[PDB]
């Protein structure tokens, strides 16, 4: 199958995601609607259940609302059963309409539908070439009070009907009891409760195995992707083991939410996206787009800096999920704002690198402040809005023009208000011109592109006041006027002679697992696939066609490899680096080192005899370790994904910058468990 197939669960770069708040989209089955104080059919009280369900989504999939818009993927509310309690916060009732208060990850939320309804949703979506991404929030269960056991449902967790335990009298330690986080540090935000939500303890074997079995169930139901909730609030090491469990079973595109504010560039965020096994929602992109197109707090130079910086900071920038707003931000469109701003931000996002996500109702110009005002019921299913037509025209390009899906990004023209960028992949090109200035036109002269000689019609058809482009030799475009608020898209597609890799997924798995290499020019006959210097051909290449290759990871030592391919003729492609071959199945193990004193600025790290521990290379050491919540300095701890059942040798390091001080004596040693978790506690050796 081609890279653009709906069956491609490893690549969403050619897709356009539509984020659906199930309850606020369409109530297709009134029979499953909650009742009493937990329901408001009018959806005036945005804190109660409005009735939106999976049958409603099925209806909108079948009546052409999404397909006519060019949507090829949906991201829905967490499908698992949530608490039924109606929580009263300051005299205001609240329900789990949002799906983030799980009580059983192995059952469905009755309000959305039954297992059968979910299956019909998967079937209906795939029948229309629409992939399905589910929200998954394994950080917590639901609101609970240690002082008030009767509050809500005490965060009780069930395993397919069987009660495992609650927040009160948690003798099993299924949850964290370190109070609440003040977001002062990453560690503080991870090992303490997020607000009043019962924080799950992933170091507890029962919780570890349970959550991993739970995701398996949803994978078996046919989901095509996973949106991980609050990934900045769970042990990064455990999440890696979680992604390994997913990829070593049935790999599907996964991206987590790591909120970033305006002007916030986070190195930890980058590292997480590059090493966890999942990508992230591109808040850096979203915030900058809002600054430039919505709030006027930065110009096109800032937009360019974001594009160039992100392309360098993210190993796989094309896996980052972009957007202009979501359920945790005020609606992009302000009630009194010119609609062209939203239209431009949409056009920009739909043609930029990554995986575009459109928050439901954006195409209907919905306005609203912070939660819950940004989660109103979609007012209309009109296909006559300008925004709907913009999506309709640009969304399909991610499918037909690989430059949009996998291409590099280069600035071709720029000033305070104008940005003309070019996307390029092989013999495919796309040039987008955007003039955010709603009152002043711009004279575009000296524009040079990679577009072949000829005339180009604006893909938007002048919908956003775009214009035709005339290109001479050398890719030089004739002078033209870019209208105020003008937005135009010019493109060219053609066959690519040389093998070109545009995407690889998953990017982390053990030998034997099948990976998907997408691009152009691979040819029809099986060629060769390279993992570092190791060549793979024949049988282990399950399938091979011009845009997609399915190949099994060779039995090579765990580590980081560069992926490259060659057609039957032997012509090599570009290299797609940063692929992590695991040393085997993964288990989350907590390492604790006692009495490791340090100076301010100096931190303790973990190094070991397996790639998961960086193979004794201080540069790839695990950490910096923590020393405040679960254990206190001079004791340090950290949760790490390591190969199950392997005997591993390790040592700790004290690092200040890149300067390292090795622990003395002989290496420590232990054998990781075959499944579940474990805690290895040793003393720092002088
Ligand atoms: O009951 C609590 C609350 O839960 C909400 O459900 C989740 C939400 O849908 C999901 O996006 C996420 O949102 C939280 C972020 O994960 C978390 O990091 C935090 O974000 C703050 C940053 O940490 C700060 O650095 C700074 O940027 O400010 C950010 C504020 O957004 O808080 C987010 C909001 O909770 O996790 C939520 C919890 O599971 C429900 O949607 C909501 O109705 C509930 O009230
Ligand atoms: O590089 C692979 C080896 O990495 C680890 O070895 C560490 C030692 O654990 C650490 O004590 C330190 O050894 C130095 C030693 O203390 C000093 O007297 C000598 O002059 O230099 C040694 C280093 O050259 O650093 C090494 C890493 O260089 C690991 O313990 C070992 O099993 C690996 O083979
Ligand atoms: O002509 C090559 C040149 O084109 C662009 O330069 C623009 C510039 O961005 C505008 O602000 C204005 O000054 O007109 C110039 C063209 O005459 C590219 O930005 C530049 O890198 C490139 O060399
Ligand atoms: O907790 C984070 C913090 O840990 C280390 O700080 C130590 C410090 O080095 C000790 O001398 C002593 O003051 O205890 C501190 C922890 O409470 C790291 O050195 C520091 O960089 C880091 O932020
Ligand atoms: O300041 C809080 C928020 O205000 C507005 O919603 C901006 O669009 C957004 O970028 C910012 O994060
Ligand atoms: Ca319903
Ligand atoms: Ca947590």
PDB file of C-alpha atoms in Angstrom, residues 184-312:
ATOM      1  CA  UNK A 184       8.125  24.487  40.373  1.00  0.00           C
ATOM      2  CA  UNK A 185      10.245  21.722  38.810  1.00  0.00           C
ATOM      3  CA  UNK A 186       9.823  18.835  36.383  1.00  0.00           C
ATOM      4  CA  UNK A 187      10.305  16.302  39.189  1.00  0.00           C
ATOM      5  CA  UNK A 188       7.752  18.148  41.322  1.00  0.00           C
ATOM      6  CA  UNK A 189       5.284  18.042  38.449  1.00  0.00           C
ATOM      7  CA  UNK A 190       5.835  14.317  37.933  1.00  0.00           C
ATOM      8  CA  UNK A 191       5.687  12.767  41.403  1.00  0.00           C
ATOM      9  CA  UNK A 192       2.972  14.953  42.926  1.00  0.00           C
ATOM     10  CA  UNK A 193      -0.723  15.144  42.016  1.00  0.00           C
ATOM     11  CA  UNK A 194      -1.766  17.253  39.048  1.00  0.00           C
ATOM     12  CA  UNK A 195      -4.276  19.440  40.897  1.00  0.00           C
ATOM     13  CA  UNK A 196      -6.550  17.021  42.782  1.00  0.00           C
ATOM     14  CA  UNK A 197      -6.206  14.133  40.319  1.00  0.00           C
ATOM     15  CA  UNK A 198      -5.107  10.823  41.888  1.00  0.00           C
ATOM     16  CA  UNK A 199      -1.560  10.409  40.552  1.00  0.00           C
ATOM     17  CA  UNK A 200      -0.873   6.850  39.380  1.00  0.00           C
ATOM     18  CA  UNK A 201       2.348   5.210  40.580  1.00  0.00           C
ATOM     19  CA  UNK A 202       3.953   3.640  37.515  1.00  0.00           C
ATOM     20  CA  UNK A 203       6.697   2.107  39.666  1.00  0.00           C
ATOM     21  CA  UNK A 204       3.971  -0.177  41.017  1.00  0.00           C
ATOM     22  CA  UNK A 205       3.983  -3.401  38.967  1.00  0.00           C
ATOM     23  CA  UNK A 206       0.193  -3.745  39.016  1.00  0.00           C
ATOM     24  CA  UNK A 207      -0.246  -0.242  37.599  1.00  0.00           C
ATOM     25  CA  UNK A 208       2.540  -0.819  35.060  1.00  0.00           C
ATOM     26  CA  UNK A 209       1.196  -4.117  33.703  1.00  0.00           C
ATOM     27  CA  UNK A 210      -2.411  -2.905  33.859  1.00  0.00           C
ATOM     28  CA  UNK A 211      -1.911   0.252  31.780  1.00  0.00           C
ATOM     29  CA  UNK A 212       0.151  -1.637  29.223  1.00  0.00           C
ATOM     30  CA  UNK A 213      -2.509  -4.359  28.946  1.00  0.00           C
ATOM     31  CA  UNK A 214      -5.138  -1.628  28.629  1.00  0.00           C
ATOM     32  CA  UNK A 215      -3.458   0.071  25.661  1.00  0.00           C
ATOM     33  CA  UNK A 216      -3.072  -3.357  24.026  1.00  0.00           C
ATOM     34  CA  UNK A 217      -6.852  -3.717  24.146  1.00  0.00           C
ATOM     35  CA  UNK A 218      -7.352  -0.448  22.289  1.00  0.00           C
ATOM     36  CA  UNK A 219      -4.646  -1.382  19.797  1.00  0.00           C
ATOM     37  CA  UNK A 220      -6.557  -4.619  19.198  1.00  0.00           C
ATOM     38  CA  UNK A 221      -9.683  -2.558  18.539  1.00  0.00           C
ATOM     39  CA  UNK A 222      -7.943  -1.019  15.541  1.00  0.00           C
ATOM     40  CA  UNK A 223      -6.903   2.477  16.644  1.00  0.00           C
ATOM     41  CA  UNK A 224      -4.428   4.197  14.322  1.00  0.00           C
ATOM     42  CA  UNK A 225      -2.831   6.555  16.827  1.00  0.00           C
ATOM     43  CA  UNK A 226      -2.506   7.665  20.446  1.00  0.00           C
ATOM     44  CA  UNK A 227      -2.556  11.145  21.987  1.00  0.00           C
ATOM     45  CA  UNK A 228      -0.828  10.915  25.370  1.00  0.00           C
ATOM     46  CA  UNK A 229      -2.133  13.262  28.058  1.00  0.00           C
ATOM     47  CA  UNK A 230       0.150  15.229  30.405  1.00  0.00           C
ATOM     48  CA  UNK A 231       3.393  13.551  29.315  1.00  0.00           C
ATOM     49  CA  UNK A 232       5.430  16.156  31.196  1.00  0.00           C
ATOM     50  CA  UNK A 233       3.870  14.788  34.395  1.00  0.00           C
ATOM     51  CA  UNK A 234       4.876  11.120  34.119  1.00  0.00           C
ATOM     52  CA  UNK A 235       8.335   9.513  34.426  1.00  0.00           C
ATOM     53  CA  UNK A 236      10.007   9.930  31.035  1.00  0.00           C
ATOM     54  CA  UNK A 237      11.715   6.577  31.482  1.00  0.00           C
ATOM     55  CA  UNK A 238       8.438   4.773  32.146  1.00  0.00           C
ATOM     56  CA  UNK A 239       6.826   6.390  29.112  1.00  0.00           C
ATOM     57  CA  UNK A 240       9.681   5.072  26.991  1.00  0.00           C
ATOM     58  CA  UNK A 241       8.936   1.567  28.299  1.00  0.00           C
ATOM     59  CA  UNK A 242       5.272   2.219  27.524  1.00  0.00           C
ATOM     60  CA  UNK A 243       6.097   3.212  23.941  1.00  0.00           C
ATOM     61  CA  UNK A 244       8.300   0.123  23.685  1.00  0.00           C
ATOM     62  CA  UNK A 245       5.357  -2.042  24.786  1.00  0.00           C
ATOM     63  CA  UNK A 246       3.271  -0.390  22.071  1.00  0.00           C
ATOM     64  CA  UNK A 247       5.891  -0.570  19.314  1.00  0.00           C
ATOM     65  CA  UNK A 248       6.980  -4.121  20.161  1.00  0.00           C
ATOM     66  CA  UNK A 249       3.357  -5.231  19.807  1.00  0.00           C
ATOM     67  CA  UNK A 250       1.405  -3.022  17.387  1.00  0.00           C
ATOM     68  CA  UNK A 251       3.145   0.312  16.655  1.00  0.00           C
ATOM     69  CA  UNK A 252       0.899   3.318  16.036  1.00  0.00           C
ATOM     70  CA  UNK A 253       1.686   7.030  15.711  1.00  0.00           C
ATOM     71  CA  UNK A 254       1.838   8.540  19.203  1.00  0.00           C
ATOM     72  CA  UNK A 255       2.181  12.164  20.314  1.00  0.00           C
ATOM     73  CA  UNK A 256       1.954  13.622  23.796  1.00  0.00           C
ATOM     74  CA  UNK A 257       0.936  16.937  25.289  1.00  0.00           C
ATOM     75  CA  UNK A 258       3.797  18.931  26.802  1.00  0.00           C
ATOM     76  CA  UNK A 259       2.358  22.416  27.222  1.00  0.00           C
ATOM     77  CA  UNK A 260       4.623  25.344  26.328  1.00  0.00           C
ATOM     78  CA  UNK A 261       3.746  28.986  26.876  1.00  0.00           C
ATOM     79  CA  UNK A 262       4.484  32.008  24.700  1.00  0.00           C
ATOM     80  CA  UNK A 263       8.228  32.392  24.083  1.00  0.00           C
ATOM     81  CA  UNK A 264       8.914  29.124  25.899  1.00  0.00           C
ATOM     82  CA  UNK A 265      11.579  26.941  24.281  1.00  0.00           C
ATOM     83  CA  UNK A 266      12.285  23.818  26.343  1.00  0.00           C
ATOM     84  CA  UNK A 267      15.402  21.623  25.944  1.00  0.00           C
ATOM     85  CA  UNK A 268      13.729  18.859  27.983  1.00  0.00           C
ATOM     86  CA  UNK A 269      10.748  19.045  25.641  1.00  0.00           C
ATOM     87  CA  UNK A 270      13.066  18.522  22.653  1.00  0.00           C
ATOM     88  CA  UNK A 271      14.950  15.676  24.338  1.00  0.00           C
ATOM     89  CA  UNK A 272      11.657  13.968  25.217  1.00  0.00           C
ATOM     90  CA  UNK A 273      10.404  14.152  21.635  1.00  0.00           C
ATOM     91  CA  UNK A 274      13.759  12.893  20.359  1.00  0.00           C
ATOM     92  CA  UNK A 275      14.189   9.992  22.791  1.00  0.00           C
ATOM     93  CA  UNK A 276      10.889   8.901  24.382  1.00  0.00           C
ATOM     94  CA  UNK A 277       9.459   7.022  21.417  1.00  0.00           C
ATOM     95  CA  UNK A 278       6.642   9.499  20.812  1.00  0.00           C
ATOM     96  CA  UNK A 279       6.466  12.963  19.278  1.00  0.00           C
ATOM     97  CA  UNK A 280       4.667  15.954  20.779  1.00  0.00           C
ATOM     98  CA  UNK A 281       1.963  18.528  20.174  1.00  0.00           C
ATOM     99  CA  UNK A 282       3.938  21.424  18.690  1.00  0.00           C
ATOM    100  CA  UNK A 283       3.145  24.159  21.232  1.00  0.00           C
ATOM    101  CA  UNK A 284       6.245  26.097  20.165  1.00  0.00           C
ATOM    102  CA  UNK A 285       4.739  26.285  16.661  1.00  0.00           C
ATOM    103  CA  UNK A 286       1.212  27.024  17.923  1.00  0.00           C
ATOM    104  CA  UNK A 287       2.259  29.829  20.292  1.00  0.00           C
ATOM    105  CA  UNK A 288       4.403  31.543  17.649  1.00  0.00           C
ATOM    106  CA  UNK A 289       1.600  31.330  15.073  1.00  0.00           C
ATOM    107  CA  UNK A 290      -0.746  32.976  17.585  1.00  0.00           C
ATOM    108  CA  UNK A 291       1.845  35.691  18.294  1.00  0.00           C
ATOM    109  CA  UNK A 292       2.260  36.457  14.594  1.00  0.00           C
ATOM    110  CA  UNK A 293      -1.272  35.967  13.206  1.00  0.00           C
ATOM    111  CA  UNK A 294      -3.517  36.521  16.239  1.00  0.00           C
ATOM    112  CA  UNK A 295      -1.990  38.693  18.965  1.00  0.00           C
ATOM    113  CA  UNK A 296       0.506  40.767  16.972  1.00  0.00           C
ATOM    114  CA  UNK A 297       3.332  40.254  19.481  1.00  0.00           C
ATOM    115  CA  UNK A 298       5.907  39.057  16.942  1.00  0.00           C
ATOM    116  CA  UNK A 299       6.501  39.280  13.182  1.00  0.00           C
ATOM    117  CA  UNK A 300       7.485  37.002  10.291  1.00  0.00           C
ATOM    118  CA  UNK A 301      11.124  37.018  11.402  1.00  0.00           C
ATOM    119  CA  UNK A 302       9.994  35.369  14.617  1.00  0.00           C
ATOM    120  CA  UNK A 303       7.970  32.867  12.607  1.00  0.00           C
ATOM    121  CA  UNK A 304      11.022  32.062  10.473  1.00  0.00           C
ATOM    122  CA  UNK A 305      13.224  31.657  13.557  1.00  0.00           C
ATOM    123  CA  UNK A 306      10.702  29.183  14.990  1.00  0.00           C
ATOM    124  CA  UNK A 307      10.661  27.167  11.759  1.00  0.00           C
ATOM    125  CA  UNK A 308      14.460  27.008  11.479  1.00  0.00           C
ATOM    126  CA  UNK A 309      15.013  26.415  15.177  1.00  0.00           C
ATOM    127  CA  UNK A 310      12.414  23.652  15.476  1.00  0.00           C
ATOM    128  CA  UNK A 311      13.749  21.901  12.366  1.00  0.00           C
ATOM    129  CA  UNK A 312      17.092  21.694  14.171  1.00  0.00           C
TER     130      UNK A 312
END
